[PDB]
Design an enzyme around this catalytic site. Structure first.
Site, PDB file in Angstrom:
ATOM      1  N   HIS A 143       8.595 -34.607 -79.608  1.00  0.00           N
ATOM      2  CA  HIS A 143       8.131 -33.586 -78.432  1.00  0.00           C
ATOM      3  C   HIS A 143       8.623 -33.048 -77.586  1.00  0.00           C
ATOM      4  CE1 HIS A 143       4.516 -34.809 -81.254  1.00  0.00           C
ATOM      5  NE2 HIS A 143       4.463 -33.444 -80.911  1.00  0.00           N
ATOM      6  N   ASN A 144      10.473 -32.590 -77.837  1.00  0.00           N
ATOM      7  CA  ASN A 144      10.974 -32.422 -76.953  1.00  0.00           C
ATOM      8  C   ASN A 144      11.187 -30.509 -76.700  1.00  0.00           C
ATOM      9  OD1 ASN A 144      12.094 -31.228 -79.217  1.00  0.00           O
ATOM     10  ND2 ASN A 144      12.551 -33.418 -78.821  1.00  0.00           N
ATOM     11  N   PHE A 145      12.302 -29.903 -76.068  1.00  0.00           N
ATOM     12  CA  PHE A 145      12.523 -28.318 -76.071  1.00  0.00           C
ATOM     13  C   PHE A 145      12.607 -27.533 -77.402  1.00  0.00           C
ATOM     14  CE2 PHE A 145      15.120 -25.041 -75.683  1.00  0.00           C
ATOM     15  CZ  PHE A 145      13.632 -24.011 -75.002  1.00  0.00           C
ATOM     16  N   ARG A 146      13.622 -29.024 -77.905  1.00  0.00           N
ATOM     17  CA  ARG A 146      12.922 -28.183 -79.619  1.00  0.00           C
ATOM     18  C   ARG A 146      13.028 -27.887 -80.131  1.00  0.00           C
ATOM     19  NH1 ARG A 146      18.451 -27.879 -81.151  1.00  0.00           N
ATOM     20  NH2 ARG A 146      19.787 -29.317 -80.112  1.00  0.00           N
ATOM     21  N   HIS A 195       2.926 -24.795 -75.517  1.00  0.00           N
ATOM     22  CA  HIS A 195       2.008 -26.047 -76.857  1.00  0.00           C
ATOM     23  C   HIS A 195       2.621 -27.215 -76.520  1.00  0.00           C
ATOM     24  CE1 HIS A 195       4.726 -25.760 -80.271  1.00  0.00           C
ATOM     25  NE2 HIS A 195       3.467 -27.671 -80.433  1.00  0.00           N
ATOM     26  N   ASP A 196       3.695 -27.751 -76.024  1.00  0.00           N
ATOM     27  CA  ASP A 196       3.840 -29.624 -75.814  1.00  0.00           C
ATOM     28  C   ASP A 196       4.282 -29.569 -74.758  1.00  0.00           C
ATOM     29  OD1 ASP A 196       2.547 -30.679 -77.938  1.00  0.00           O
ATOM     30  OD2 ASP A 196       4.324 -29.267 -79.215  1.00  0.00           O
ATOM     31  N   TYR A 210       6.716 -41.975 -82.981  1.00  0.00           N
ATOM     32  CA  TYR A 210       5.162 -43.088 -83.548  1.00  0.00           C
ATOM     33  C   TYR A 210       5.731 -44.316 -83.249  1.00  0.00           C
ATOM     34  CZ  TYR A 210       2.589 -38.565 -85.677  1.00  0.00           C
ATOM     35  OH  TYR A 210       2.096 -37.941 -86.234  1.00  0.00           O
TER      36      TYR A 210
HETATM   37  C1  LIG Z   1      -6.037 -36.224 -87.314  1.00  0.00           C
HETATM   38  O1  LIG Z   1      -4.828 -35.389 -87.704  1.00  0.00           O
HETATM   39  C2  LIG Z   1      -3.310 -35.053 -88.576  1.00  0.00           C
HETATM   40  C3  LIG Z   1      -2.399 -36.190 -88.080  1.00  0.00           C
HETATM   41  C4  LIG Z   1      -0.938 -37.013 -88.349  1.00  0.00           C
HETATM   42  C5  LIG Z   1      -1.264 -36.069 -89.976  1.00  0.00           C
HETATM   43  N1  LIG Z   1      -0.095 -37.174 -90.886  1.00  0.00           N
HETATM   44  C6  LIG Z   1       0.729 -36.951 -90.038  1.00  0.00           C
HETATM   45  O2  LIG Z   1       1.338 -37.171 -88.664  1.00  0.00           O
HETATM   46  C7  LIG Z   1       2.568 -37.015 -91.030  1.00  0.00           C
HETATM   47  C8  LIG Z   1       1.980 -38.472 -91.723  1.00  0.00           C
HETATM   48  N2  LIG Z   1       3.912 -36.360 -90.359  1.00  0.00           N
HETATM   49  C9  LIG Z   1       4.055 -35.574 -90.306  1.00  0.00           C
HETATM   50  N3  LIG Z   1       3.772 -35.056 -89.007  1.00  0.00           N
HETATM   51  C10 LIG Z   1       3.606 -34.556 -88.270  1.00  0.00           C
HETATM   52  C11 LIG Z   1       4.776 -33.230 -88.706  1.00  0.00           C
HETATM   53  C12 LIG Z   1       4.651 -32.579 -88.120  1.00  0.00           C
HETATM   54  N4  LIG Z   1       3.825 -32.622 -87.463  1.00  0.00           N
HETATM   55  N5  LIG Z   1       3.393 -33.290 -87.364  1.00  0.00           N
HETATM   56  C13 LIG Z   1       2.409 -33.748 -86.384  1.00  0.00           C
HETATM   57  C14 LIG Z   1       2.968 -34.070 -84.510  1.00  0.00           C
HETATM   58  C15 LIG Z   1       1.929 -34.411 -84.172  1.00  0.00           C
HETATM   59  C16 LIG Z   1       1.019 -34.956 -84.324  1.00  0.00           C
HETATM   60  C17 LIG Z   1       0.073 -34.506 -85.448  1.00  0.00           C
HETATM   61  C18 LIG Z   1       1.240 -34.169 -86.958  1.00  0.00           C
HETATM   62  C19 LIG Z   1       1.149 -33.541 -87.444  1.00  0.00           C
HETATM   63  C20 LIG Z   1       5.438 -33.532 -90.475  1.00  0.00           C
HETATM   64  O3  LIG Z   1       6.170 -33.184 -91.161  1.00  0.00           O
HETATM   65  N6  LIG Z   1       4.864 -35.036 -90.919  1.00  0.00           N
HETATM   66  C21 LIG Z   1      -2.045 -35.524 -90.387  1.00  0.00           C
HETATM   67  C22 LIG Z   1      -3.392 -35.459 -89.768  1.00  0.00           C
HETATM   68 MG   LIG Z   2       0.541 -31.407 -78.788  1.00  0.00          MG
HETATM   69 ZN   LIG Z   3       3.480 -29.393 -81.126  1.00  0.00          ZN
END
Ligand SMILES: COc1ccc(NC(=O)[C@H](C)Nc2nc3c(cnn3-c3ccccc3C)c(=O)[nH]2)cc1
Ligand SMILES: [Mg+2]
Ligand SMILES: [Zn+2]
Ligand SMILES: COc1ccc(NC(=O)[C@H](C)Nc2nc3c(cnn3-c3ccccc3C)c(=O)[nH]2)cc1
Ligand SMILES: COc1ccc(NC(=O)[C@H](C)Nc2nc3c(cnn3-c3ccccc3C)c(=O)[nH]2)cc1
Ligand SMILES: [Mg+2]
Ligand SMILES: [Zn+2]
Lengths: 326, 326
Positions: free
Chosen positions: B72-75, B112-113, B244
């Protein structure tokens, strides 16, 4: 936070509308930004669908074609463009002029001295230079400035006119050529006479009348340094003389004739300006006031103050040169 | 000649309109340049009288307020906005939305972030952080992003909305709040249903239908990494897992509960994306294809490929593990 110089501060952008703007504080890039701002702030980018990134590449190319002369350099180009901008506001020109006229005025101002060599037409002619030969001794430098101006616009990446219909391009090109060639001081008396004649009954609808007004306006901005605060204006006199001496020096080392006002042995900062302000700058602005009264208080005022200071500075110069005599 | 990096080249201006654009090739300045272009290109600068200098300062203040997080950065915000920009072209969104809705869509994506701390809401809430206490456990991060966004726009020299009548500002602000808050994944299923429901008889006339459509649009762009080319996409998975793990380690260290999908002893690049692409990403784009068919080819296609790729990558991964106990 504390943004980079390329970004103007709201204060700077506000000051950009006045002739009191201190042109000496900026680096080429900050100047490029002020020029860029002027095109947006005037509706030009809008009204002529100028590609915003092209506007920037054009400004860089322009800047790249100015030389490092002590006077005729990119900062001079900026003062001229910046002064023209001030007048669009001071005199509310957008009321009397079409956007095409404003485009021509600004663009001609920016390109009016492109690729200046640092030696005026007289040198060119007497030295029989490549420019003088190319332009048959007719306003060689100014002709050259236009040519370079349109060579730059010919490069598609710099063509800020690429989205203008050919009919309008022809009109803009004709207008810019007229203005750039009008900057040749050799035609000062003539142009001034023509204008004053039309002045006996000006008409904002008479096309020849407006062409002369524009010629007078760019001429006004081109030689308006003394209109500025003495602190901002004076360093320019030194640059001009630096360029002048450089020419006369060369003219002497080549047996070519030399002009008194460019001769190290005959001119001083004050003598250069007293005649100029009294017989050139003031009369020209004086007749413009008849069309725009606000001009008097904002530009004719500092010129009187300027003329006065040099007249005093001249007495001291003489007093000091009398203690150097024998 | 050769113009600075912040002057986009034509080749770049064209690649910028596709989900295929390579985001890892640029530095903050170049990215700030592309964003600026987008506002000009979509005519937002035009129809809202966005002073172009103000827009530059704003984008810069936004960049300052993003943090050095691995994901979660500028990019990340650049990707989201760029993807949004892509879709406006691909789907001809200006044929369905007003310039106000495109402004909301684009502006919300960039903001947004804002000021994301690098630890999700579950952390804020369990650790009873200052944001969790400030927002009473209700979308603490999303609420914060939105607040910083308007704190930035409150700075006179960053208010790219300065020339919009207060009536319009209200509408833009409500839209942005709605879009940014809709990015909380805790709200995913809920939002997907409202949309699927109204999709049965979508109506671009209905304001509620349009709000859900815009919420779906910003959600799609926010998690669209896998839509991009395998080379451009993969690095992001690592950034996300890095973030994460940083959280899970801290959680384990402070005795806070740990989420399985952030557990260093369970998650693998492959398992993370298979579930995510199959159950979150693809289903969402599938419903959007019913309104914009061209989406299937440009976005669903690369997702199917990415899914198969990670699924194969999972077999390999398992094969390799069992080869280590046989
Ligand atoms: C509860 O809402 C959610 C939260 C996470 C997920 N699944 C994931 O986060 C998966 C394991 N990783 C994932 N997470 C991703 C991606 C893109 N954004 N993003 C993301 C980033 C921040 C918070 C939530 C998500 C999904 C991605 O390409 N993969 C699915 C549902
Ligand atoms: Mg966010
Ligand atoms: Zn975002
Ligand atoms: C033959 O046409 C001319 C030529 C020169 C002059 N006056 C001057 O050059 C005087 C002596 N110096 C002067 N010249 C100036 C000034 C501003 N521009 N400028 C200038 C620069 C290049 C060419 C001509 C002029 C006037 C200035 O403040 N002083 C007046 C008429
Ligand atoms: C949103 O969090 C998730 C949840 C599930 C998935 N996808 C999966 O479950 C993958 C494809 N299959 C799988 N996934 C697993 C396992 C164990 N953990 N785990 C997993 C993977 C990623 C994230 C969270 C878990 C628990 C497993 O035995 N198989 C991906 C992300
Ligand atoms: Mg000249
Ligand atoms: Zn000049």
């Amino acid at each position: 936070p504390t943004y980079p110089k390329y970004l103007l501060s709201p204060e700077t952008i506000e000051a950009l509308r006045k002739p009191t703007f201190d042109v000496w504080l900026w680096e080429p890039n900050e100047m490029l930004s002020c020029l860029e701002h002027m095109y947006h702030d005037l509706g030009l980018v809008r009204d002529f669908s100028i590609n915003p990134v092209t506007l920037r590449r054009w400004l860089f190319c322009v800047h790249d074609n100015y030389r490092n002369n002590p006077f005729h350099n990119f900062r001079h180009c900026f003062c001229v463009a910046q002064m023209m901008y001030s007048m669009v506001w001071l005199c509310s020109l957008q009321e009397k002029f079409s956007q095409t006229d404003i485009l021509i005025l600004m663009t001609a101002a920016i390109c009016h001295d492109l690729d200046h060599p640092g030696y005026n037409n007289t040198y060119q002619i007497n030295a029989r230079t490549e420019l003088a030969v190319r332009y048959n001794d007719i306003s060689p430098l100014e002709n050259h400035h236009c040519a370079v101006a349109f060579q730059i616009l010919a490069e598609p990446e710099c063509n800020i006119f690429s989205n203008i219909p050919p009919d309008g391009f022809k009109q803009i090109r004709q207008g810019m050529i007229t203005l750039i060639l009008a900057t040749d001081m050799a035609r000062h008396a003539e142009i001034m006479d023509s204008f004053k004649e039309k002045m006996e009954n000006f008409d904002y609808s008479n096309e020849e009348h407006m062409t002369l007004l524009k010629m007078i306006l760019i001429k006004c901005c081109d030689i308006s340094n003394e209109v500025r605060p003495m602190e901002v204006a004076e360093p320019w006199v030194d640059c001009l003389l630096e360029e002048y001496f450089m020419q006369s020096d060369r003219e002497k080392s080549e047996g070519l004739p030399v002009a008194p006002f460019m001769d190290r042995d005959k001119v001083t900062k004050a003598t250069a300006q007293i005649g100029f302000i009294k017989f050139v700058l003031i009369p020209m602005f004086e007749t413009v006031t008849k069309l725009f009264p606000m001009v008097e208080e904002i530009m004719l005022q500092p010129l009187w103050e300027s003329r006065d200071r040099y007249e005093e500075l001249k007495r001291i110069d003489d007093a000091m040169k009398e203690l150097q005599k024998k």
